[model samples]
Target chain A: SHMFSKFLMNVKGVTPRGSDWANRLGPVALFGYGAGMPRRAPLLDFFLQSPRDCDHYAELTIHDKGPIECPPETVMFMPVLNCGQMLDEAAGTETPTSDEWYLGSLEASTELLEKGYVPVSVGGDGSATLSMVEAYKRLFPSDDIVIVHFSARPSVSDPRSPLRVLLDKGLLKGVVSVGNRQVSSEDRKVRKLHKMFYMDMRDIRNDYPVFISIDASVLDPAFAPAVDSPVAGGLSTRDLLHIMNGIRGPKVVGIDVYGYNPDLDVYRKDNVGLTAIALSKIIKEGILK
Target chain B: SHMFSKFLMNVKGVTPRGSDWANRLGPVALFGYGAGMPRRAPLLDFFLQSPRDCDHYAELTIHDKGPIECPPETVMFMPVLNCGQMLDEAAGTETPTSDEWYLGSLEASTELLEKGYVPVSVGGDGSATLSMVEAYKRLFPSDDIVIVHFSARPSVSDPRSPLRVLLDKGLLKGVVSVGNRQVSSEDRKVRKLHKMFYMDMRDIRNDYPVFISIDASVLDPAFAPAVDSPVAGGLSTRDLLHIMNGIRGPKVVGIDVYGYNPDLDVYRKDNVGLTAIALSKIIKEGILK
Candidate 1:
């Protein structure tokens, strides 16, 4: 206890209940009482509005192993392991730390291609988008790649940025957009050269478009409250996917869904609905197909 | 090219923004613009105010590194890892992802312990407290654990839960108080049995004890406007640390400084101050000796 007594000597007291400010905001109820976060519950009811079974773009079906109704024209029903990506495991809690998640996603991508299947990656963290786009370029060398990024910012044109790391690897040729806003001047300078099209909710009012990657923060939090990340005023899901359908075309190479960390979402709350909508739009719109 | 064309068949124009609400909540300018958030500048200022060079606590030297003076016994430093975690990278934006932030704290903990440091863990999530307390148990194996958990609701708690994974290994023992008047009764019940001192802020206003974990959500947002994870009306930096320092003691292991994901703290630009205040209290209250 070397000098331990000295450290513990200042036996001061802390007051427990200072005030209740959080009460003004909605509180989390009925979660992790005697048990832990459930496998999946109705975190938010908004998802009920979506059709349970829907069509998808070119089904990347390995046939049997894919989701039901790979719809005739579906291009890919590429299945990948969720693994530890969604499991809200505590950090530094495990030893040697598991890279199993990263490896699993990588393997999933590689195997799908080997099996003549086109793999798509979707989950929390925007990093996953790179895999889906890169894989598409690997398979279709002749296609001129154009991305239509839907986000909260105006432009991310530094073609070399990791946000488009897969693009610079020569996986992309051009890009377009529909709804994008809150773009800073600095960001605009970075993305000046790309063949991009954009309109923020304020600008487009409704004209959103489909693209390979959909970072959820682009939507405002008030309308889309339950996302892995929440913004204040984003477009309605109805409006966004209308644009997805608006932009669906043959030149589209793939669809990549990005950024949905459960820890941030907590017990599958706000984000589940948003995620389902995004998925439904991609598959139903049949852009990648 | 794909059935994506069919998916777009349901396209419709968005309904206009609704306008049935009254104006009490909205000053003309206020209502028209976006909702306002607390600025981090003031919080940063508060952090700078804590007695920096106080020679109250003993200096802890670990691995034979030069001793970094332990804060006075009264000072307590909760773990503040708004920077990064094991699974996440340094946040390119203002905030790091939750996973990377929470995990990075563990590495920081090793350094603190070598210097006989002890502070509350201002964790990215409630689960972060587990490690702070675990560190304490490792140092003082024989001490009985008494925890003062403050939350409006119960977080994900299972004996084998990942948050408590280390503690479940039999390294910790304590009581928790969840769901004060500020939270729903359901949330209270969920968090109640997890700890020994499961009293809400209402139950134990000023009667705080020697050992405690300060939840940022419980603070009033007015004074602590820039909390990483903002629950409006949370404890001001002054109010929170007042109780924290008030509860200086021999049994207090460490603090779980949860919440305040840097990913969310970006651009709005007030997190630095809020974080600094958190650090100041840890330094002043002698937790990080």
Candidate 2:
């Protein structure tokens, strides 16, 4: 999800997405991002392009677009969330985070759930997933929750990992993973409550029957390895997609993907290309139909 | 002014200063210091208040609006011109500068003037003044510039000091300094062109003087001690302000507020407060009126 979060910032086709979304969903638009990262400029560029592409609506980009440079249509530099430099200036507080702050991550999710808006937030780290789950649980207590996570490791217990907290709280239900390897001891403790899979890269290449989570890091570091966190002994690109195709069905309310960090990639091209192709395939074959 | 650019991302009250004669009016909204120096959120609070206050239509913001939790009214976050971080980032830039990074201390002035946007930049070092002068020359097409500077020891030969290059160009307009106790060769030349005033803390106390050009290092490090290029014996807060009020007039078309390094700031509060007070007095006293 952190990978998805990063990708979301650099979303290439703002014009098409904005125009298409506006035409379909009426004139409603949403903007969000933290401005500290370099990707902010691109995010803002896309935000600006959206309304310019679809001119009919007298847009009003609410001033809660975080402290980033997202110039959403009609909101020529809104300021509600224009907090100053550095992240987490206001953290762990009751103050309602305007948008896209670390704490605001929870705020945005909470607000979206309260407003009955479909909340599909891409996260920067596993903690990001925890925020979404917490918000979802808080907002829709009656709804059945399912979290199918795809990663190269089924367990992460570095003390710093938020996964431990989720596991300790037993907040997750039906946690299914693909391409898992190198299980940390603390991670295994959390896995006792769920049906887990540790399908390695070799298993996928052999065409073993499997469901794919494709954390996108499920590739040889030599191949597509610019992820924020990279793991060895992962699936090949083709095998990863094939596995991704396996997790198809209704009742799959939320399919979260994570772990694509371009900074670690050898050339950066691999991550972008794979992400684009894999995401397109997921939408087309998994979500689109 | 790329360097003078603002993070008017989505804050409130930021009018583009008319983008006509207003752009020529220069950066009315000026800031300095560093992001991490101040703990209080007032500067940022004021900056976040942009939505409500931009009705006044002043332009330019020279810092990253502090903390980001509360932006100033009618202002944007301009991190580039922030003397502290600019110095840090510039110091980190590798030589032969593969990227379109700044070439020298003097890039912003000329570059922004050429771009048709009056630029007011911050520098980590006194050498940054040369760049501002360069910029003014491009805009004015004449070298008849006057200066009111504040420093501890007057010298430049470090290749990074603005005083180092002034003698070479013979473009000396009287520099009225308030904090210099010692004089270097460069300081001697500066004195030849400009009346030099060396005041000790005992002489001026917190009472700043009235003058034209204001450097970011003017305040005693005790009050605003966040300058990356800290001058050893600078003016007290009150004395520097007094100089600002005295020397600034219609002929003073620009200012280069440099040297507030965010890293050394207490919590970035010093930056916000220094910028707020210094700039407020200047604008209120008709420097730009």
Candidate 3:
């Protein structure tokens, strides 16, 4: 059963009640809401209002409808160092900076891993995935960090690149980078692009458990336009779903979905529904199986 | 088949090609794009690039690829006197102001009526509906002007209200106003609120053909939050669809859907798809049937 099947309620002068649907889904945790992002999505804010009810974690404003009841053990909210915020601050030249957000996510992932719970994160920016990758590396340092990145960036390497750091650590394993990008700027600096060399699912080894990460902007402007940085050439809704459905893993451990901006949506709930439906599909095909 | 099946194509070093999908949907014309709206949607702009291709009318940029191909009799682009533009121009006293935009749209509607084509318009503001109603009155002066508005406004009965004007002219046959709004301000000056009596579809008589106008903001923010003037209480997407589906016969001549902003969308194409799918449903259930 969908958690938000009755999401739309016609209540007169009554605040809508939160749902406990996520609890039914079994040991699932959601990580969302960035500390420094400019715009906030009302739908997400509403969902996160009572995180315990939904079994999720987010930065939400105080609401009249009671406090969150879920214990801190089941749900966690961590303030990550958003990459968008990082760009605004002038960086040091000599000392290589560490990504606190990634490290923070790493710490949280470790906490969840220790408890043997699957962590599902939702965010929009590139840093969300970077954090997940770093988190996976810390939790299982000996295991190859296999990833399925739905992104337009040719390579996830930069001045403060988490992907590069993972590669340097010889923890980079298989990557399913869907979208194609020739060149792009990051950190207010230009960098040469590098393409990943992999053809099919066969190329991805099952030696290491995988982490699924979605950057919605990796989709074309026609499909997932509300993403942080939309590129021209990208995957469609079908292509993304096909990849998710095809994943038959030696454990597809966790999933992280980002790049959803309700304020940027066209018909409001359509984007939400799309994200919800896609996430539902992933849960059914990847996580549940 | 979906009109935009080939929406996503990763053409290396090539701009994507626009579709000719709207042409297949017979005898219908589209009028969209506000004269001076703040933000512009790239998808809307791209679709409106060449009006003829989509069998629609819109404000678009000059493209290197030739002029619009549809014969003038089938599709035409005209800049109606926009009401929003009128607001910026301080009104003159005692002169019983004329809505030139309304008159302009009336003229265009007359042109389309002469050619026996149903004009389906899309707009951002409520005034667009006001203009269309006024346009219909001029075209069939003796006929009762029928309207089915899925809106939240209690009543359209202000001093210079279009619905009131149509009623005063003895041209209002019936109305199917779906969404409910208790109180709301219509204008910046003299911000007095108004309410309307509840009526059903049975009250609507088929004396004359009807124009279907959708004020997307009349929808609950959860469904259509991207609207220009969002109200507290409104209809669900299902409610809107049911109303659209229920309207059969009485010659549902045209449809005008407004209140969509991609920048405000949550998942980007979800709202676009919602509007698209809803429009398609309207065509199938209401118009085509």
Candidate 4:
């Protein structure tokens, strides 16, 4: 998201999404990816681009009417949660963090929740899911939280990772990993999530408020070359959109999709169009309906 | 402009400038610097960043209510003069040109002049001055064109170069090369330009419509590190603005300021501030009054 952040911020004007569409879709919160691999991240571009797109994306869906366009007012581009800032704050306190940006992500989600709107997040890397889950847990501390993740790896294994910490606490209501090759966990609590990834949507229970996170690297690198951490054998654009379409009903509260690098694309190429198309589909079949 | 074009285009929205203030200033035209060097140019970012500042500069001057800041409606961001397309067209017509974007620069300036508005250009390299002259000549075939350039190079050499060709053809009215160390031209026609570099503004006759072009590289690299070409011994920001102030009157019709690459800039850095100040001065003391 660092490299893609600057490039994307430059073009968000082409599509108009902002605060105009908030009522119908709720307050759309973006999780800036200043926390992933590059510790000393270019937070400026990510911070700049995230807000630019939020207004336009909201405008495209709200004002323009339907699958492609929205209102300018309903979208909100939250100040990017710089991992550096979060770490600085955390270091000042007692909690030490090995990962970046997540601290801000959790806080942003809580802020959106306090404002009486569901927080939807677009992440920069797989670690983004950690923020989405952590935020949900903070809001509904007693309740089990559900995660709908799309990535090649079913479960991230970093012990210091928030995802691991959340699982250990048994706070996760369910997990949905699309295009997952194999099951990594066999615990009684995670068993339900494993089955749901392979099962049809109708069989799954509408348990808790849903938070969606898309790691662009989880999608086929051939289609989404501008990803945070690219991997082969991922979902195609069609399959990704179709999976997103499946979350049409129930209490799907928030969403975050991330990982697009502008430098990876050819010069003067309109790769943002592809990302826009994916976003449009999400807004239409996933967010709006 | 290609790579930087897409990236810069996405974020220019952080600052707002456009048709809101066009009346007092007259029509302001931007000349993209795609033609100077590197047959394939990264004009995209330069083009994107240029207009991003136009509105802000206009707004700053307008708000400040100083000597400048005319109406916003007079400004325009010309379609980038594509070096590749220019070459293709030139080759098809058998003109066999070395440079590309400049042809478009000339045509763009002519377009502004034809529309009854003075043309302003933002150049990619020192060579951009060539387009300003060629375009002025196209309109005023018989008149001598004046050039008030502020750069370390006394006069750009290279017989095959456009500036040299324009001088040889007796098309130039005058040349004022600020901070020049020595003379590179001995021709009688070029000598008039050489002498005027150190002369006072009042002593110089303001003949024909004046076109101003700024090669950001002409300024000290420390102040403008985001230029196409980097060199030492250039004008300080204060001096650049002062020189622009000197050309306050006498039928100045067009202006082009160029050579800014965003990639070289810090992500959140407001390097556009300097450009804005320079442009705001032009709009008020130069373009408006």
Candidate 5:
């Protein structure tokens, strides 16, 4: 209250707003929201949801195989959300929350879907994925949905599983788990009945409304070392591209790419880290089309 | 293969054994086995089970807290067992194994307990901690044991949980989870009744036989970077020592320390890495006495 009281100055800069959100999200557009984070950030929002410059931003062309170009101006960005579900997974148990955070997830996803935008979620531990799926379910109430899960192992055994929930709710049609090396008998028993099979099966429903979830652990330690739980001998970068490209882009109504922890991402490339790049590649090359 | 086979080579060197297992494992001894690894190695076995040279090995002294001497003549090394439960955890389900691998875990732990040695386990993901506890239970059928878990989250929600199984079998008396930042309502519902409490709670029983399992994620990223799941605002190195030192050393029946990934450990110190140092410190300062 002494000398500093009289020295108040303007410490704020005009916030930068990308005014082209409407133009960016065209008919064949991809948009994003930050979910399952520790009180999300604008940085994460920019990374996940920002409009990529078609002339400069790098992503593989399906036919040409080049780190160049984009699919028109159909890309959009959204703000951060207040969803924090890391604790639930950490404890290996899901506790009932206020459902307010999930309400945000539902509303945002519902709003995006309502606007003909393919809602993409990215960040934190893989929880609150159910909320996104729930949002998807609300939009397409009658349609049976199939999930394309890319991970080292298919977590089908848990009672509180999103997969099980979707199936129980009669919304999940089938699940195609890619890059899974291990499947216990119990897991097999559970997933088999639901027409759940690995990538090697060569029998997946592409026509069904698909929701793609790329867990960072599915990428080998060589590519994404700073994941929640990395497994050895995972899907290669080549495999990721191939798998993503193979999926019918239109069928992918929603997407979630997560599990790369920034804290432990020391050796990663600075500005555009490996995980972000990889995630971006999946978005641009695979899903955006 | 043809070119290499054509040349006369001396690839095989004479194997080296420590040759002092009996002397190292005194009455107040800590013997170790490798369980839940992908084909355990002599390197991991050495790191987990090697005797601390009291004259030089770094650990804390109670009377005068310093990176000081060890408890004399009370540590032993053992060979790795062919136990791989990483697959089980990765799949989030446990399949029926041949019982051969768990047999090794059971036999080694049972053998050590029979010989009056405190059996310690160090490995990949934490599945075979159950087998070691089962071994402990076999030796003392009537007595109940309590697990002191150190991790980002306490995994008490799963039906296949070691804690739940132990408790259901009337073996696990209680659980004291340290450094847990989040606990769900369901987790709390299950654990609260089991006498499970966090680091904030000050009513943990000391005299009860305790099994300390330190998941590397418990330590903040500043200390242990290459964990399976790195959470921010974790137990500091000081907190770890304080918690470990507070326990009655003799009452601690066994220990298991793991979750540091060598491939992801880029910034960690070579040879005597952070995880190894922390694990060794617990052995020397907390349990050996």
Candidate 6:
């Protein structure tokens, strides 16, 4: 959790996260589609991971609200560059990783979990789900894969909704969406379905594994200003921490953090949109807990 | 508490510290020598202060373990320019801010308190004391202005020690110092004095006002790396916060934060030394408590 362990003058000081969690994890080649500008998503890796190499991330946790636990299982950030071999042929060069991007991610993600590494796709956008679509269906393909979506806007009925895309493909076994401030008039109607529902911590299906997707805008803009769309009266970082930590279990297998638009972050260089803290909170309270 | 209030896409979002605490406190001209290049003390202002003007601070708390309470009183950072008036003549222009720098701070600080504005001197170094000496004496000349020093080193008898300078001038009525990992062999001899003492919170003189001085090195370097000398075993920011908030009385009148040598801060521009977090903790949990 302390990405900066490698960047210290000497690692002899504070941050007792215990370096035993230091090195491990095999690489899963991810599609390299550009994630907005200046690549702020990688900054999340800087906030959440601790690399053994000098200056692997050089990041300090923006907040200590949660512990930088070793997780007793080590995780490392592997920036995958190769597009999917199978999908690489399908999504003709006309569009960079269009629909096939997720398929590429699916192959890489599947290969990762096969080797026992938890797959975390820090995104080019909310689109990590697009990449994970195949992996969710293939691995544990028999069980219901619930997508716990946390965002300020429910994109259910929108032309560009992931939930809409998956449900259309009949890919989602369940969907628990919450944190939207205003359900679109279009969305409110689509959400009328039996399976598409809002989140209630106690009622979440513990029988299946969940892919946690957090849109940065679900957090109040004051807490994270780097998102593409920010809505008011949203969850504070603390609120989200409680939500993430409260997941008793579905056992989070994969996760995505999206909507962080570095261009929207005036303090992007300083990492002050509080976005990294949000990511760290998710790992500490949500993923690790 | 939110330095980012003005940097937001709009102020209508998170940060409930209340804008009523904005826009107050007149300027106090401080003498600036050089707090080591790139000037990270200014970064502390970026972390602790909320600017009404767009990007005045453009900062954010690195942690929220403590709240950014308004203190019902407002604070504005004023970088002082002119050196001392009387001592300005005595220094012979040979030195920049020499002893006169603190004396200059004295005049400015005295003038500020007279007008009901609490004076805070963020340092060019620990030298804020050089300036505040007169201000502390003139304002409460009759009372013992106890200097509660929090630092990893007790420079007590060292030729360069601030405490040594004041005690030499017979300026200190009382001193309660703590957090030193080792008493310099030179310093151990100074323990023979009647008033030079270590801190035991319960015994702190409550009847008098105290001047709080923090040397960044007192913190374990992992917690605050931007210091001149970072000792391995030192106070954690939380430890300092607990000690600070534990001060039941002896109203704090003025404060100084020093030893934050930005040149030592490899991540100075990104503000990750956790130095700002230490400063914020002092403000939120310690000073304002």
lDDT of 1 by residue, A77-111 (tens): 43221111233223333221123433333334434
Docking model 3 quality class = incorrect
Q: For model 4, what is the C-alpha lDDT against the true structure?
A: 0.45
lDDT of 2 by residue, B1-289 (tens): 1322222221222333333343233433333322223322233233333222111123333443322122244443222122222223222322222122233334444444443333444333444456566556656655466555665655553544565465356554444565665566765664554454544342222222122345545565544555555655555443454454445334444555545444554321112333333323332222222
What is the lDDT, from 0 to 100, of the residue A190 in candidate 3? 23
Listed in order, each prediction's TM-score against the native is: 0.35, 0.33, 0.40, 0.37, 0.42, 0.48
CAPRI class assigned to model 2: incorrect
B152-184 per-residue lDDT for model 3 (tens digits): 664464756555555555565565566656444
Leading candidate by DockQ:
3
- Tens-digit lDDT string for candidate 4 (B103-148): 4555555555554445555434555567666766777787667766
- Model 3 interface DockQ: 0.08
Model 4 spans with C-alpha error above 4 angstroms:
A1-289, B1-25, B39-57, B60-103, B142-144, B182-195, B199-208, B226-230, B258-289
Number of clashes found in candidate 4: 77
Q: Given candidate 1, what's the lDDT at residue B195?
A: 42
Model 3 misplaced stretches (Cα beyond 4 Å) = A1-252, A260-289, B1-28, B32-97, B120-145, B183-208, B221-230, B236-251, B257-289
lDDT, candidate 5, A1-289, per-residue tens: 1111111110011121233334343222222333444333233443444233211122222211112222444332222222222223233323324264455556555655655555566664555466677887787787667788887767667866656667777777777788876667867888667777676313342567778787777876655665655677776444565566667533566777667665544441113344543444344443444
Candidate 1's clash total is 104
A1-289, model 2: which lDDT tens digit per residue? 2322333342222222222223122212232333222232222222233332112222233333322233445443221111112233333322223234445555554554443223333323344455656676677555545455566555455544544455456564445555554354345555664454444322223211111223555553324433443443345456555655545432333323345432332322332333333332332222211
Compare candidates 1 and 3 on TM-score and give the better one.
3
Candidate 1 per-residue C-alpha lDDT over B247-275 given as tens digits, one digit per residue, 9 for 90 to 100: 43343455554444333432212113333
DockQ of each: 0.01, 0.01, 0.08, 0.01, 0.02, 0.01
Instruction: State the lDDT of candidate 6 residue by residue for B1-289, as single tens digits.
Output: 1211221112122233234335632222222223323322354444344221111111122322112333233433232222212222222333333444444455556654554334555545676764565576777677666777888777676766677777777778777787887566677777666357774215453776767777777767656667766777766554675566555444566667667665675332233434543454343322232
TM-score of the A chain in candidate 2? 0.54
lDDT leader: 5
Instruction: Show model 1 residue runs off by greater than 4 Å.
Output: A1-51, A55-104, A114-118, A154-162, A202-211, A226-229, A263-289, B1-289
Give model 3's TM-score versus the native structure: 0.40
Candidate closest to the true structure, highest TM-score = 6
